[PDB]
Design a protein around this ligand. Structure first.
Ligand SMILES: N[C@H]1C[C@@H](N2CCn3c(nnc3C(F)(F)F)C2)CC[C@@H]1c1cc(F)c(F)cc1F
Ligand SMILES: N[C@H]1C[C@@H](N2CCn3c(nnc3C(F)(F)F)C2)CC[C@@H]1c1cc(F)c(F)cc1F
Ligand SMILES: *[C@@H]1O[C@H](CO)[C@@H](O[C@@H]2O[C@H](CO)[C@@H](O)[C@H](O)[C@H]2NC(C)=O)[C@H](O)[C@H]1NC(C)=O
Ligand SMILES: *[C@@H]1O[C@H](CO)[C@@H](O[C@@H]2O[C@H](CO)[C@@H](O)[C@H](O)[C@H]2NC(C)=O)[C@H](O)[C@H]1NC(C)=O
Ligand SMILES: *[C@@H]1O[C@H](CO)[C@@H](O[C@@H]2O[C@H](CO)[C@@H](O)[C@H](O)[C@H]2NC(C)=O)[C@H](O)[C@H]1NC(C)=O
Ligand SMILES: *[C@@H]1O[C@H](CO)[C@@H](O[C@@H]2O[C@H](CO)[C@@H](O)[C@H](O)[C@H]2NC(C)=O)[C@H](O)[C@H]1NC(C)=O
Ligand SMILES: *[C@@H]1O[C@H](CO)[C@@H](O[C@@H]2O[C@H](CO)[C@@H](O)[C@H](O)[C@H]2NC(C)=O)[C@H](O)[C@H]1NC(C)=O
Ligand SMILES: *[C@@H]1O[C@H](CO)[C@@H](O[C@@H]2O[C@H](CO)[C@@H](O)[C@H](O)[C@H]2NC(C)=O)[C@H](O)[C@H]1NC(C)=O
Ligand SMILES: *[C@@H]1O[C@H](CO)[C@@H](O[C@H]2O[C@H](CO)[C@@H](O)[C@H](O)[C@H]2NC(C)=O)[C@H](O)[C@H]1NC(C)=O
Ligand SMILES: *[C@@H]1O[C@H](CO)[C@@H](O[C@H]2O[C@H](CO)[C@@H](O)[C@H](O)[C@H]2NC(C)=O)[C@H](O)[C@H]1NC(C)=O
Ligand SMILES: *[C@H]1O[C@H](CO)[C@@H](O[C@@H]2O[C@H](CO)[C@@H](O)[C@H](O)[C@H]2NC(C)=O)[C@H](O)[C@H]1NC(C)=O
Ligand SMILES: *[C@@H]1O[C@H](CO)[C@@H](O)[C@H](O)[C@H]1NC(C)=O
Ligand SMILES: *[C@@H]1O[C@H](CO)[C@@H](O)[C@H](O)[C@H]1NC(C)=O
Ligand SMILES: *[C@@H]1O[C@H](CO)[C@@H](O)[C@H](O)[C@H]1NC(C)=O
Ligand SMILES: *[C@@H]1O[C@H](CO)[C@@H](O)[C@H](O)[C@H]1NC(C)=O
Ligand SMILES: *[C@@H]1O[C@H](CO)[C@@H](O)[C@H](O)[C@H]1NC(C)=O
Ligand SMILES: *[C@@H]1O[C@H](CO)[C@@H](O)[C@H](O)[C@H]1NC(C)=O
Ligand code: NA
Lengths: 728, 728
C-alpha cells in the first residue's frame, strides 16, 4: 500500500517542486544558477559557460543573499546582510565587483543601511536611496552625487515608498525610474508628516529586557493620507553643475482639487514620460504625457495628450489603473481597460486622440501585455475554452487584428493550462512557464518561428517520487446561479467515492478580484488534508471575484462583507446537494481577507458550518488602510458610506458564534492587518460569553512565514480540524 | 440527589458570604453601612442611631463610590467618578458635605481627577494630591495651600507613589503621613526621571481607530530605580501670601552611599517621627528616629537613636522591614523581627539603646502586632496547636512576659481557627473576624475582661442554603521531607471514598513567604472542581513558604525557580502514591508567581503531570520589577547573580513541554507581569516545535477581573481541565 501525502511531507518539503528561474541579460543570453555557479546560456543552441565560479566569493566573509549584473555586463552588485521589512521592502549591505578586473571595489562603497539600489537601464550608472535621500554614482568607484536633502525617517521619503504606497499602490519599495538610456532619473517624494502612526510591541530575542515599540506611518480608512510630488533630474549633468536641479512635474488641476495618488510612472521615450494620477475616490484617473523642452529644461504635458479613465460601476483597474505599453516612437500605446460590456481588453491609443480602439474583445479577459514588437503584441488571457481560471499566451498581428495566434493552448493541453512567460531583451526568445494542472513544465522557444527549442525543466524527478504516493485529485467546474456561471475547485481524496459522505473544508479568500478556482498545481496543506485525512477541500469564486468581467467583480462595490460572504455560504449548500458531503462535517477557513469572510460566515447564523479558522483577519474596515479599503468602500463618513462600514464588522455578529467552534490566530507583529483587529474580535466574543480557541504568534507578521511559526500554525490548525471532524 | 456547587454558582456568586465591615470612630462607637444608610453603633450595648440617611443624596446626580467621614464627625467626603489605575491607585472627584449645616460645600472644592485625599487624623483638615502636587485645606470651604510645585506626570511624584513603590514598597498610592494631631504633614517625593518605561498597546472600545500606547515608568531587574526624598511641613503655619516651607530629612550615610529605598514612615509622637531606609541589596535596613527642634524649626535624627536591622540568610522582613509600634510617650517601641532561631517574634526597643529584648519566642511566628496599651500588647500568631496555617489573637502582659493569654483559641475551636481583629481607638473594644475552617463569624468583645458581648454576623443564612448542596471538605495535614514537615491541603469531593482513584489538580502559588495551606473557608473555582467534577484540588507549602521561620523561607534566597519548584513536584509525587489518587490524571495550575512555578514544573521533565495551566506567569526574572525581584535574586550582573537569573527561565525548558498539555493565558494590558513574559514563552515553544493551547485577554491586566473576562477565563480553564481528565 502506497503512503499518503502527510503533514510532515508538506512541512518538511520532502516532495520538492523544481523550477527554472533564468535572467535574460540580452536578446539571446540568460543567466541561470546551477550548483552555486552562475552559468550563462546561449538561448539558440543551449550551450553554456561559467559566468561566475561558485568559489569566487568563498572568502568574501559574508553570505551573499542575491546578485545583480549591470546592463553592460561590466559589474555585478552583491547583496548581503539581507534584512526583510514589509512585503517588498528590505535592508541590506552591498558591494560591487568589477567583472573585468576581477577585483572587488573597496572605495566609495555603497553605504550600509542602503534602502534601495538600482542600475541604470543601460551601462553601469547606479542610483540608491540612503537615509531617505537619493544618490547617483556615474561610476562604481567614484563619489556619489546627492540628489535630495529633505529625506527624514518616517516623514519624507525620496525615491522609496512609505508603507501604504509600497503595499497598495506600487507593489514595490522603489519610487524611482530611470529613463530608457539612463539620461534622466525620475522619482517620487512622499510626505507623511500628518499620517497617523500604528504602534505595536516587538519582543525580539529573549535577551531584550524592554519590548520595543514599532511605529509606522499608516493611514487607516478615512485618515490623513501621505501627499506626493514628482520630479525628474538630468543625471548627465551631475558632473557639470554643483547641484543638479530636480524639475517638478505637477499633478493636473483635476487632481489638485483634493486628495489624490500618483499611481503609475512609465517612460515612453528618451524624452517623454507618462504619469497616471488617481483621486482619493478611486473611480477617476488621469494620465499626463510629458515632453522634455530642451530650451527651457522643463517638462510640459499638453492637455491634448491627457487621457481620462473612470468607472461608473466600481473602481478603476483590477487593483490600480493599468500600465501603458508604448510603441517604439512613443506616439501610441496599448492599455488594458474594460470595454462597454465590462470585460478587460487591449485598447490602442494615439497619444493625442482621446478615443482608443479595442483590439481584442469577447466574454473573457486579457490578464496582461507581455511584449510589444514592431509587428506583434503578446498577451496572456483566459480566453481558451472559456476557462476564467486558465492562462495562455497569444500573439496578435499589429497590421491585421483578425490574426491572433495562441502560442501555448495546444502545446500539452492535458498537462498545461496555466502559463506565464518571460521574453528575452528584444523578444527574440521566450520561456514558457506552465504551472498546472499537471506538474510545472518550463520550455524555451524562438519568436522568429514560434518553434520549441527545448525543455528546460519537466519535473521528471518529482513525478517519479509521486508515483509511490496516493495523491489527491483536483476538480475544476462551475455551478449556475441566477443564469450566471460561478467556478469552484475541489481537492478530492485518493480513490474518491461519490457514494460516500466526506467531511468538507471550504478554503476561502474571496476578496475583490480574487480567484481561488484555477488550473494551478499545488502541493500544500489541502494536499495533506485530502490525501491523508480524506477531507475534501473546496474553494469558490462568487460575486466580487476577478477575471470574469465587471458585472461580477464590481458586484461588491461599496458593499464588502455581503455578497462575497453570502455566496460562500450558498456554495457550501450547493456542495451539500452534490451528495458526497457529510452535512454534519462542513468547516471553513481563510487567511487575511479570507479570515474576515470566514469570520463573517461563522457569525452569520446560517447553521451550515460546524467550525472555522480565521488567520490574521480584518474585523472592521476602519482598521485597515485607506488606499485598499476606500477603493471598494469609499469614505467612512455619514455623507459617504459610514453606515455600511459600521454594519460590516465581525464584532457585531459575536452572539452568533455561540453556534460554532472557532479558532482565531494572529501574529503580534502584523504591520498589515494589525493585531488590533483580532484583539477586538476576541474582546467582543468575551463580552457576550462565547468560548473559542485562540493562538497568537510572537513577532510574526501578516505572513506568519518564519520556518518554525509556519510549521507550528499548520500543526495547530490540523489538530483543530481533525478534532472538529472527529478524526483520529 | 441534592445539587452540587456548580461553575455557574461560582461565577454568578449564588452563595455569598456575609461580612460585617465596621469603622471605629472612637473608643466606644463604630460606623456600619446598612441598607445604604450609615448607622452609628455603641459597642457596649449594641444600640444604634442613623448617622446619615441613604436618601440624603438622592438628587446628588453622581453615583457615590465611597465616603469618608472626618474624625470629628462634622464633615463627610464623597467619592465619585472613580477611575482605577494600578493595584491601589485610582483618581476620582470629591465633594464635601457639612453634616451640621446639612449642606454640600460649593466653594473651593477639591479638583476633579484628584489622585489621593485624606482627612487629618484629628479634626477636619484635608490633604490631597492633584497633578502630582500636594495641597492642604485647613477648612473644607476655604482655599487650599499649594505645598509642592515640582509635580510632573511620570517624572516627579509628591505625596503619591510611582508604580514600583505602590506595588512593592508601600502597598498604597499614598505617600502622605499626618502627625498624630494634624500639626505636621510628612511626605515623600519620588523622581523617576531616568526610569525606563514599559510600553504596551491598549485597544479600548471598538470605536478607537488607532490603538493607544500606554507608557509606564517601570524599573525591571537591574534597571535605573526611582530616587526618593523625604519632607515634613508644618500645616499650622501656612500662609496665603508666602509659599510653604518643607523641611527635608535626609537618609543616613550608610544609605546615601548607593541606591536605596524609603520603606516605612511611622509617627511616634506629636514631634517625633521614625523612618526606615533599605539598601538596594535588601538585607540591610536602617531606622532613624527624628525629633522636632522648636528652636531651629528643623528635624534632627540622633545617631544614638539609629537602629540597624540586617539578615545574613536572606532579605529583611517578610516582604519588607516590619513597622514599629511606639508607646504613648514614644520613648520605646515594639517590632517584629527574626530572632536567632530565624522565627519572627516581637522585640522591645528603647529608642536610644542598641539591644532590643524579645518578648515572645518559640517555633511559630507572630503575624502582626494589633494593639498596644500600657498593660498589654495584642497580637496575632500561628502558635495555637503548632498549626502555621491557623491564626489567633493573644495578649501579653507587659510586666511579665510569661503571662500570655490566647483570646480566640477556645471561642469555637471547630469552626474557628483563623482570626483577624479590629480594635477600637484605645483598645477598649475589639471585633474578631473568624474566616475558617467553618463559615465566617464576626463577634464584638470588650478588653477589660475579654467579654464576648455579641455576635454581629454568623452567616446562618448561608449555612441554611449550603445544607441543600453537596459541599466538598478540606483536609489540612503535612508530609515530612528531610526531618522537616511541610503542610498541604486538599479540597476533597463530596462523599470522598478512599477506595476510589480521583484525578488531582495541584493549585500552586509558592512565591517567597506564600501560604497556600491554611484553615480558611473559601468558595472558589476549586470548590466547583471538587463538588461538581469530583477532582481533588491540593496545594502545598514547600521551601520558600512563610510563617514557619527563615530556615524554610530563606531556602530560596538568590535561588528562585529551584527548591520551591522541586518541592511541588515532590509533593505531587507523594500524593500520586496515595491510594485515592489517579497517577495518570494529575495536573497543575497557578497564576502570577504560581504561573511561573507551574511552567517550571511542566518543563522539568518529571513526567508526573499530564497537563497544566499558567495564567500571567513570570518567565524570566529580568523581565520583572527591581524591588521585588532583586529582594530575592540580588542583581543580574556577572559579579552578583546573573548566572542564576539566566538559568531560572521558563524558555530554557521549552523542549521538556513535548510530553504535556499546556495552556498559556495572559491579559494584553498587564502592567505588572508584562504580556512580554508570555510572548517569550510561546515563541520558545514555537521554536522547538511544541504544540500548546493559548488565550490572550484583550485589555485585561494582571487580575483579569472584569466581569466578562473572569467568567470567560474560568469557563475556558474548566473545559481544558475536564478534557485533560476525560471528564464528561
Ligand atoms: N493589501 C493587499 C495587496 C494585494 N496586492 C495585489 C497586487 N499585488 C500584490 N503584490 N504584488 C502585486 C502586483 F504585482 F500584482 F501588483 C498584492 C494583495 C492582498 C493584500 C491584502 C488585502 C486585505 F484585504 C487584507 F486584509 C490584507 C492584505 F494583505
Ligand atoms: N508584586 C507582588 C506584591 C505582593 N504583595 C504582598 C503584600 N501586600 C500586597 N498588597 N498588600 C500587601 C500588604 F498589605 F499585605 F502589605 C501584595 C503580592 C505578590 C505580587 C506579585 C509577585 C510576583 F512574583 C509576580 F509575578 C506578580 C505579582 F503581582
Ligand atoms: C555557445 O556555442 C557557440 C558556438 O557553438 C559559441 O560561439 C563562438 O563563436 C565564436 C565566434 O568568434 C567562435 O570563435 C567560437 O569557436 C564559438 N564557440 C564554439 C563552441 O563554437 C558561444 O561562445 C557559446 N556560448 C556560451 C555561453 O558558451
Ligand atoms: C511635508 O508636509 C508638511 C505639512 O504637513 C510641511 O510642513 C509645514 O512646512 C511649513 C513650511 O515650512 C511650515 O510653515 C508648517 O509649520 C509645517 N507644518 C507641519 C505640520 O509641520 C513640510 O514642509 C513638508 N515637507 C516637504 C519636504 O515638502
Ligand atoms: C541643492 O539644491 C537644493 C534645492 O535648491 C537645496 O535644497 C534647499 O536647501 C535650502 C537651504 O539648505 C532650503 O531652504 C530649501 O528648502 C531646500 N530645498 C529643497 C527642495 O530641498 C540643497 O540644499 C542644495 N544642496 C547643496 C549642497 O547646496
Ligand atoms: C539619451 O537620450 C538623451 C535625450 O534624448 C540624449 O541627450 C540629448 O542628446 C542630444 C544629441 O543627440 C543633445 O543635443 C541634447 O542636448 C541631449 N539632451 C539631454 C536632455 O541631455 C542622450 O545623448 C542619449 N544617450 C545616449 C547614450 O544615446
Ligand atoms: C499638636 O502638637 C503640636 C506640637 O507639640 C502642638 O503645637 C505646639 O503647641 C505649643 C503649645 O501651644 C507651642 O508652644 C508650640 O510652639 C507648638 N509647636 C509647633 C511645632 O507648632 C499643637 O498645639 C498640637 N495640636 C493640637 C490640636 O493639640
Ligand atoms: C547582603 O547580601 C550581599 C549579597 O549576597 C552580601 O554581599 C556580598 O555578596 C557577594 C556575592 O554577591 C559575596 O561574594 C560576598 O561575600 C558578600 N559579602 C560582602 C561583604 O560583599 C552581603 O554580605 C550581605 N550583607 C549581610 C549583612 O549579610
Ligand atoms: C445607645 O444607648 C445610650 C443609652 O441607652 C444612648 O444614650 C446616651 O447618649 C444619648 C445621646 O447620644 C443621651 O440622650 C443619653 O442621655 C446617653 N445616656 C448615657 C447613659 O450616657 C446613646 O446615645 C446610644 N447610642 C447610639 C449610637 O444610639
Ligand atoms: C530628578 O532627578 C534628575 C536626575 O535623575 C535631576 O536632574 C539631574 O539629571 C539631569 C539628567 O537626568 C541632569 O541634566 C541635571 O543636571 C541633574 N540635575 C538637575 C537639577 O537637573 C532632576 O533635577 C530631579 N528633579 C527634582 C525635582 O529633584
Ligand atoms: C471638575 O470637573 C467638573 C465637570 O466638568 C466641573 O463641573 C462643572 O460642570 C459643569 C457641567 O457639568 C460645567 O459647566 C463647568 O464648566 C464645570 N466647572 C464649573 C466650575 O462649573 C468642576 O467644576 C471641576 N472642578 C474643579 C475643581 O475644577
Ligand atoms: C560549485 O559549488 C558546489 C557547492 O555548492 C559544488 O558542489 C560544485 O561541484 C561546484 N561546481 C562545480 C562545476 O564543480
Ligand atoms: C558596514 O558596517 C559594518 C559594521 O560596522 C562594517 O564592518 C563595514 O566596514 C561597513 N561597510 C561599509 C561599506 O560601510
Ligand atoms: C465616483 O464615486 C462617487 C461615489 O460613489 C460618485 O458619487 C461619483 O459620481 C463617481 N464618479 C464617477 C465618474 O463615476
Ligand atoms: C435606602 O435605599 C434603599 C435602596 O437602595 C432602600 O431599600 C431602603 O429602604 C432605604 N433606607 C431606608 C431607611 O428606608
Ligand atoms: C511659589 O513658588 C512658585 C514656584 O517656584 C512660584 O511660581 C510662585 O510665584 C511662588 N509664589 C509665591 C507667593 O512666592
Ligand atoms: C535535606 O532535604 C532537602 C530538601 O528538604 C534536600 O535538598 C537536601 O539535599 C537534604 N540533605 C541536606 C544535607 O540538606
Ligand atoms: Na455575649
Amino acid at each position: 500500500t502506497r503512503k499518503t501525502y502527510t503533514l510532515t511531507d508538506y512541512l518538511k518539503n520532502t516532495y520538492r517542486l523544481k523550477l527554472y528561474s533564468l535572467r535574460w541579460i540580452s536578446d539571446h543570453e540568460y543567466l541561470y544558477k546551477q550548483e552555486n555557479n552562475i552559468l550563462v546560456f546561449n538561448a539558440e543552441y543551449g550551450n553554456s559557460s561559467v559566468f561566475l565560479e561558485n568559489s569566487t566569493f568563498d572568502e568574501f566573509g559574508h553570505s551573499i543573499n542575491d546578485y545583480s549584473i549591470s546592463p553592460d555586463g561590466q559589474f555585478i552588485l552583491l547583496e548581503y546582510n539581507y534584512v526583510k521589512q514589509w512585503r517588498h521592502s528590505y535592508t541590506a549591505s552591498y558591494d560591487i565587483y568589477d567583472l573585468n578586473k576581477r577585483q572587488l571595489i573597496t572605495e566609495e562603497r555603497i553605504p550600509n543601511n542602503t534602502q534601495w539600489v538600482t542600475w541604470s537601464p543601460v551601462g553601469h550608472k547606479l542610483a540608491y536611496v540612503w537615509n531617505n535621500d537619493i544618490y547617483v554614482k556615474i561610476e562604481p568607484n567614484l563619489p556619489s552625487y546627492r540628489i535630495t536633502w529633505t529625506g527624514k525617517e518616517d516623514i519624507i521619503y525620496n525615491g522609496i515608498t512609505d508603507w501604504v504606497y509600497e503595499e497598495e499602490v506600487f507593489s514595490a519599495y522603489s519610487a524611482l525610474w530611470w529613463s530608457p538610456n539612463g539620461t534622466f532619473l525620475a522619482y517620487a517624494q512622499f510626505n507623511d508628516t500628518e499620517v497617523p502612526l500604528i504602534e505595536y510591541s516587538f519582543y525580539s530575542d529573549e535577551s531584550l529586557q524592554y519590548p520595543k515599540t514599532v511605529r509606522v506611518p499608516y493611514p487607516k480608512a478615512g485618515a490623513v493620507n501621505p501627499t506626493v510630488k514628482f520630479f525628474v533630474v538630468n543625471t548627465d549633468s551631475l558632473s557639470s553643475v554643483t547641484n543638479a536641479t530636480s524639475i517638478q512635474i505637477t499633478a493636473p488641476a483635476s487632481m489638485l482639487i483634493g486628495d489624490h495618488y500618483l499611481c503609475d510612472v512609465t517612460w515612453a521615450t528618451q524624452e517623454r514620460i507618462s504619469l497616471q494620477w488617481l483621486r482619493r475616490i478611486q473611480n477617476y484617473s488621469v494620465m499626463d504625457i510629458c515632453d522634455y523642452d530642451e530650451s527651457s529644461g522643463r517638462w510640459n504635458c499638453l492637455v491634448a495628450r491627457q487621457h481620462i479613465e473612470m468607472s461608473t460601476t466600481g473602481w478603476v483597474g483590477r487593483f490600480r489603473p493599468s500600465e501603458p505599453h508604448f510603441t517604439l516612437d512613443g506616439n501610441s500605446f496599448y492599455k488594458i481597460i474594460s470595454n462597454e460590456e465590462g470585460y478587460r481588453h487591449i485598447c490602442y491609443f494615439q497619444i493625442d486622440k482621446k478615443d482608443c480602439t479595442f483590439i481584442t474583445k469577447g466574454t473573457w479577459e486579457v490578464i496582461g501585455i507581455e511584449a510589444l514588437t514592431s509587428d506583434y503584441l503578446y498577451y496572456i488571457s483566459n480566453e481558451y475554452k472559456g476557462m476564467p481560471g486558465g492562462r495562455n499566451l497569444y500573439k496578435i498581428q499589429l497590421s491585421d487584428y483578425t490574426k491572433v495566434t495562441c502560442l501555448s493552448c495546444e502545446l500539452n493541453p492535458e498537462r498545461c493550462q496555466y502559463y506565464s512567460v518571460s521574453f528575452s531583451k528584444e523578444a527574440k526568445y521566450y520561456q514558457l512557464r506552465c504551472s498546472g494542472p499537471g506538474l510545472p513544465l518550463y520550455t524555451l522557444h524562438s519568436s522568429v518561428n514560434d518553434k520549441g527549442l527545448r525543455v528546460l525543466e519537466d519535473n521528471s524527478a518529482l513525478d517519479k517520487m509521486l508515483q509511490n504516493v496516493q495523491m489527491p485529485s483536483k476538480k475544476l467546474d462551475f455551478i449556475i446561479l441566477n443564469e450566471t456561471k460561478f467556478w469552484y475547485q475541489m481537492i478530492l481524496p485518493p480513490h474518491f467515492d461519490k457514494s460516500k459522505k466526506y467531511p468538507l473544508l471550504l478554503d476561502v479568500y474571496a476578496g475583490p478580484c480574487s480567484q481561488k478556482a484555477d488550473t494551478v498545481f499545488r502541493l500544500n496543506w489541502a494536499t495533506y488534508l485530502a490525501s491523508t485525512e480524506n477531507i475534501i477541500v473546496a474553494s469558490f469564486d462568487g460575486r466580487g471575484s476577478g477575471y470574469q468581467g465587471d458585472k461580477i467583480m464590481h458586484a461588491i462595490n461599496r458593499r464588502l462583507g455581503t455578497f462575497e460572504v453570502e455566496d460562500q455560504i450558498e456554495a457550501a449548500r450547493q456542495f451539500s446537494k452534490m451528495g458526497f458531503v457529510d452535512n454534519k462535517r462542513i468547516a471553513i477557513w481563510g487567511w487575511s481577507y479570507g479570515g474576515y469572510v470566514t469570520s463573517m460566515v461563522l457569525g452569520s447564523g446560517s447553521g451550515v458550518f460546524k467550525c472555522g479558522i480565521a488567520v490574521a483577519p480584518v474585523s472592521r474596515w476602519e482598521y485597515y488602510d485607506s488606499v485598499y479599503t476606500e477603493r471598494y468602500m469609499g469614505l467612512p463618513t455619514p455623507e459617504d458610506n459610514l453606515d455600511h462600514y459600521r454594519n460590516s464588522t465581525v464584532m457585531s455578529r459575536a452572539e452568533n458564534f455561540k453556534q460554532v467552534e472557532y479558532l482565531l490566530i494572529h501574529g503580534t507583529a502584523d504591520d498589515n492587518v494589525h493585531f488590533q483587529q483580532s484583539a477586538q474580535i476576541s474582546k467582543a466574543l468575551v463580552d457576550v460569553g462565547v468560548d473559542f480557541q485562540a493562538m497568537w504568534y510572537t513577532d510574526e507578521d501578516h505572513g506568519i512565514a518564519s520556518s518554525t511559526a509556519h510549521q507550528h500554525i499548520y500543526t495547530h490548525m490540523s489538530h483543530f480540524i481533525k478534532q472538529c471532524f472527529s478524526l483520529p
